[PDB]
Design a protein around this motif. Structure first.
Motif, PDB file in Angstrom:
ATOM      1  N   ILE A   1       0.825  -1.197   0.000  1.00 11.46           N
ATOM      2  CA  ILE A   1       0.000   0.000   0.000  1.00 11.46           C
ATOM      3  C   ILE A   1       0.867   1.259   0.000  1.00 11.46           C
ATOM      4  O   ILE A   1       0.586   2.210  -0.730  1.00 11.46           O
ATOM      5  N   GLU A   2       1.933   1.260   0.797  1.00 15.96           N
ATOM      6  CA  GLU A   2       2.825   2.418   0.855  1.00 15.96           C
ATOM      7  C   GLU A   2       3.478   2.660  -0.498  1.00 15.96           C
ATOM      8  O   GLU A   2       3.639   3.804  -0.930  1.00 15.96           O
ATOM      9  N   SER A   3       3.865   1.571  -1.156  1.00 15.91           N
ATOM     10  CA  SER A   3       4.489   1.645  -2.467  1.00 15.91           C
ATOM     11  C   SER A   3       3.481   2.190  -3.470  1.00 15.91           C
ATOM     12  O   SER A   3       3.774   3.130  -4.214  1.00 15.91           O
ATOM     13  N   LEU A   4       2.290   1.599  -3.487  1.00 14.52           N
ATOM     14  CA  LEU A   4       1.243   2.041  -4.403  1.00 14.52           C
ATOM     15  C   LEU A   4       0.941   3.523  -4.258  1.00 14.52           C
ATOM     16  O   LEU A   4       0.804   4.234  -5.249  1.00 14.52           O
TER      17      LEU A   4
ATOM     18  N   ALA B   1       7.156  -6.355  -1.909  1.00 18.14           N
ATOM     19  CA  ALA B   1       5.998  -5.460  -1.953  1.00 18.14           C
ATOM     20  C   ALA B   1       6.079  -4.502  -3.142  1.00 18.14           C
ATOM     21  O   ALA B   1       5.071  -4.235  -3.794  1.00 18.14           O
ATOM     22  N   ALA B   2       7.275  -3.989  -3.418  1.00 20.08           N
ATOM     23  CA  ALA B   2       7.470  -3.064  -4.529  1.00 20.08           C
ATOM     24  C   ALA B   2       7.114  -3.792  -5.815  1.00 20.08           C
ATOM     25  O   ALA B   2       6.452  -3.235  -6.690  1.00 20.08           O
ATOM     26  N   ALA B   3       7.550  -5.045  -5.921  1.00 20.66           N
ATOM     27  CA  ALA B   3       7.255  -5.839  -7.113  1.00 20.66           C
ATOM     28  C   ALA B   3       5.742  -6.005  -7.298  1.00 20.66           C
ATOM     29  O   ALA B   3       5.224  -5.830  -8.400  1.00 20.66           O
ATOM     30  N   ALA B   4       5.040  -6.349  -6.222  1.00 24.61           N
ATOM     31  CA  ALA B   4       3.591  -6.533  -6.284  1.00 24.61           C
ATOM     32  C   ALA B   4       2.922  -5.234  -6.712  1.00 24.61           C
ATOM     33  O   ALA B   4       2.017  -5.237  -7.542  1.00 24.61           O
ATOM     34  N   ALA B   5       3.362  -4.129  -6.122  1.00 23.43           N
ATOM     35  CA  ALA B   5       2.798  -2.823  -6.444  1.00 23.43           C
ATOM     36  C   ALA B   5       2.991  -2.495  -7.920  1.00 23.43           C
ATOM     37  O   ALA B   5       2.097  -1.952  -8.570  1.00 23.43           O
ATOM     38  N   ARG B   6       4.167  -2.822  -8.445  1.00 24.32           N
ATOM     39  CA  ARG B   6       4.481  -2.558  -9.845  1.00 24.32           C
ATOM     40  C   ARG B   6       3.556  -3.363 -10.753  1.00 24.32           C
ATOM     41  O   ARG B   6       2.973  -2.839 -11.706  1.00 24.32           O
ATOM     42  N   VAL B   7       3.415  -4.644 -10.441  1.00 23.60           N
ATOM     43  CA  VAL B   7       2.586  -5.545 -11.229  1.00 23.60           C
ATOM     44  C   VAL B   7       1.111  -5.179 -11.251  1.00 23.60           C
ATOM     45  O   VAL B   7       0.455  -5.281 -12.280  1.00 23.60           O
ATOM     46  N   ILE B   8       0.597  -4.739 -10.115  1.00 26.86           N
ATOM     47  CA  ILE B   8      -0.812  -4.402 -10.021  1.00 26.86           C
ATOM     48  C   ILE B   8      -1.144  -2.976 -10.461  1.00 26.86           C
ATOM     49  O   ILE B   8      -2.314  -2.658 -10.671  1.00 26.86           O
TER      50      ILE B   8
END
Ligand SMILES: [Cu+2]
Length: 275
Positions: A16-19, A167-174
């Motif tokens: 969430i912070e990354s997003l 988390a950064a990876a997940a944020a990037r993907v979504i």
């Protein structure tokens, strides 16, 4: 609109912070069982929708208008069926590194979910996450106190990364385009054995720390006499055994390529122990 299920954990917090660095808070929806007990999420300013994960209907309502769903790890069956009913167009799921071939018992549940996604007809991407450096460092204090770090990973190489990295990876993907329908094997750029961990621990702590390799039963029979529950102990022991077989090793550098920078090294993580 992006929805996140199982976002009440440490990984979810980071995602969430990354997003929030690129997506307006209101365009992020965290689906939780009780918005009251989820003070952290609410504190982030994101949209929070309540839903009991054992209630497909509740989940379906909570997923209304959601285009992309990040499912952070049955419960997943209800979520996937609800996503189908609500019209979710893309699902990214946090799985386990090389799940189909992984020696770790933790792969079982992930495989079940990966199968559900494959049969859902919904475009999806698997974020096959490797180990968290934090998983082993959680035991660093005890290892430092007794000068010994125990395990059953042998000489297995652990390509760990931080929750922040995953988390950064997940944020990037979504959130950004070009990551749909992928199977990403995510792990650290470099890998290390528990022997090297102990050495890194000795180096930065000044105190002597040696790695002691035990057998799965002894290691488990060692965690079941320190407090940790049996199930938890059994998993940890099983994981180390999986690791000894290369189950936690990967050198594709998919994670660093995805996030745009080097993954956080063991050395850096270890440094946080003596801040
Ligand atoms: Cu740091």
């Amino acid at each position: 609109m992006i929805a996140i299920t199982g976002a009440t954990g440490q990984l979810g917090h980071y995602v969430i912070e990354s997003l929030m660095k690129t997506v307006p808070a209101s365009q992020i929806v965290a689906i939780v069982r009780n918005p009251a007990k989820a003070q952290a999420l609410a504190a982030q300013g994101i949209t929070v929708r309540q839903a009991d994960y054992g209630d497909e209907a509740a989940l379906t309502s909570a997923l209304q208008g959601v285009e992309k769903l990040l499912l952070i790890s049955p419960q997943h069956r209800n979520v996937i069926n609800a996503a189908k009913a609500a019209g979710v167009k893309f699902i990214a799921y946090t799985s386990l590194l090389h799940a189909d071939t992984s020696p770790l018992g933790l792969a079982d549940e992930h495989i079940e979910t990966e199968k559900m996604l494959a049969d859902s007809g919904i475009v999806y991407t698997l974020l096959r996450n490797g180990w968290y450096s934090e998983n082993y460092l959680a035991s660093a204090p005890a290892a430092l106190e007794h000068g010994v770090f125990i395990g059953a990973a042998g000489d297995g190489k652990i390509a760990s990364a931080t929750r922040a990295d995953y988390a950064a990876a997940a944020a990037r993907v979504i959130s950004e385009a070009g990551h749909e329908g992928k199977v990403y094997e995510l792990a650290g750029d470099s890998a290390w054995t528990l022997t090297q961990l102990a050495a890194e621990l000795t180096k930065q702590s000044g105190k002597q720390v040696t790695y002691q390799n035990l057998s799965e039963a002894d290691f488990a029979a060692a965690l079941k006499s320190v407090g940790l529950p049996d199930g938890l102990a059994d998993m940890l022991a099983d994981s180390d055994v999986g690791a000894s077989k290369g189950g936690l090793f990967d050198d594709s550098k998919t994670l660093s390529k995805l996030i745009g920078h080097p993954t956080t090294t063991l050395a850096e993580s270890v440094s946080h122990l003596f801040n």
